[PDB]
Ligand binder design. Structure first.
Ligand SMILES: *[C@@H]1O[C@H](CO)[C@@H](O)[C@H](O)[C@H]1NC(C)=O
Ligand SMILES: *[C@@H]1O[C@H](CO)[C@@H](O)[C@H](O)[C@H]1NC(C)=O
Lengths: 34, 49, 255, 49, 36
């Protein structure tokens, strides 16, 4: 059976805490709607 | 590449991919969730041999 | 003024002795690692260091330290370095291009036809990973390639191996230089309420700046601010009428 | 917040991990990069003014 | 090494001779597929 993955596969990339900000990464992650 | 939106008292609340749609690439380049009407330049295209 | 330093609870001295004073050493074609953790290790009992100065190594704290058992020819010790051109070094043990630890050289006079090294393999080697010829140092006479003992150390993360140094009390609402688990800084420490995940450690706001710190001992919340500074200016009526001036301090509540 | 080719992007981390002859080159690289950035900002400010 | 419906998620990654294991948890609805 063949399904799709949406809005899934996100984790905290590092171990520091932010608030009301935006950050971009380049590591291995699960692409949306895969 | 991803782009993650935190919050106050904040875990991960919303995130949109950076390599899914041209609109997604635009959101990833302007670094905001709301883009007003206009023309924008994002990157460069090239053909891989 | 003053000083605050907070470290985790001190433990027993962890035994570096038997891993440096070991009666047997494994070969290179079988690579064993010796994991070292949960320590207060003293380095005064102890070459070349790539990334960390050896004199200042005693102060800063680390997450985890890894030691490796490794026996190699005499003149080949200079080929154990990041991005070395050795094909034999490319086939037995590759160091990554980015490196942090140190390489130690030791003598083995007492030690034949027992140690080998792999020199035939298809493709290169990714670092820190796991057809044969016998070594040449079987003759115990001094030739020039007499064997040496080489141990290499490899070192944002939770920390349990820190330097032995006294922990002091904590001062509040008065700017001071602080040292939290090797992270140094200077400013006002404030007991503000910003939430942390129970496994989470540090806090940064915008520009890769240490803003919030979880206390390593009582597990409370400390916000870090830079204490007062700014531009100063002098106003004068010109040095033809008087010599008295006035001083303006910019954007400070100057109590 | 960029390292400009140095081993780390924080000056206090450089001065807490190196002696006074191996940290000098990293300090030099930070000085050069931040000088370039500040000069660029000053020039753009002058034209806008 | 010895240590001591719903959807549980394990993320495995491998780099620099190290392997990271990540865990998660979420209460889901009983259905044949997976909801978005
Ligand atoms: C660490 O040391 C402090 C001071 O003695 C003690 O109160 C605390 O229980 C110890 N353990 C932890 C996990 O903080
Ligand atoms: C400066 O601080 C004092 C005490 O915190 C306060 O009473 C005063 O109003 C402050 N000044 C200004 C301009 O807010």
């Amino acid at each position: 059976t063949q399904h799709t993955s949406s809005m899934r596969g996100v984790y905290y990339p590092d171990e520091i805490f932010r608030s009301d900000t935006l950050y971009l990464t380049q590591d291995l992650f699960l692409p949306f709607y895969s | 590449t991803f782009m993650l939106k935190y919050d106050e008292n904040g875990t991960i609340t919303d995130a949109v991919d950076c390599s899914q749609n041209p609109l997604a690439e635009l959101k990833c380049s302007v670094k905001s969730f709301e883009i007003d009407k206009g023309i924008y330049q994002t990157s460069n295209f090239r053909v891989v041999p | 003024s003053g000083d605050v330093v907070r470290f985790p609870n001190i433990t027993n001295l962890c035994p570096f002795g038997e891993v440096f004073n070991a009666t047997k050493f494994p070969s290179v074609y079988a690579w064993e690692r010796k994991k070292i953790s949960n320590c207060v290790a003293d380095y005064s009992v102890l070459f070349k260091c790539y990334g960390v100065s050896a004199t200042k190594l005693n102060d800063l704290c680390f997450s985890n330290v890894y030691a490796d058992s490794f026996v190699v020819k005499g003149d080949d010790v200079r080929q154990i370095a990041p991005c070395q051109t050795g094909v034999i070094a490319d086939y037995n043990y590759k160091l990554p291009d980015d490196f942090m630890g140190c390489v130690l050289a030791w003598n083995t006079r007492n030690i034949n036809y027992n140690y080998k090294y792999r020199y035939l393999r298809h493709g290169k080697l990714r670092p820190f990973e796991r057809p044969l010829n016998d070594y040449g140092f079987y003759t115990t006479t001094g030739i020039g390639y007499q064997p040496y003992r080489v141990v290499v150390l490899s070192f944002n993360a939770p920390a349990t191996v820190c330097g032995p140094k006294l922990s002091t009390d904590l001062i509040k609402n008065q700017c001071v230089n602080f040292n939290f688990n090797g992270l140094t800084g200077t400013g006002v420490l404030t007991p503000s309420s910003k939430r942390f995940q129970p496994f989470q450690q540090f806090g940064r706001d915008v520009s890769d700046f240490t803003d919030s710190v979880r206390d390593p001992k009582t597990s409370e919340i400390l916000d870090i601010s830079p204490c007062s500074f700014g531009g100063v200016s002098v106003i004068t009526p010109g040095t033809n009428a008087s010599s008295e001036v006035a001083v303006l301090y910019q954007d400070v509540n100057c109590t | 917040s960029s390292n400009f080719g140095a081993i780390s992007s924080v000056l206090n981390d450089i001065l807490s991990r190196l002696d006074k002859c191996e940290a000098e080159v990293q300090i030099d690289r930070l000085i050069t990069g931040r000088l370039q950035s500040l000069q660029t900002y000053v020039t753009q400010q002058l034209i806008r003014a | 090494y010895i240590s001591d419906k719903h959807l549980r998620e394990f993320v495995f990654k491998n780099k620099d001779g190290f392997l990271y294991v990540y865990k998660g948890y979420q209460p889901i609805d009983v259905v044949r597929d997976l909801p978005s």
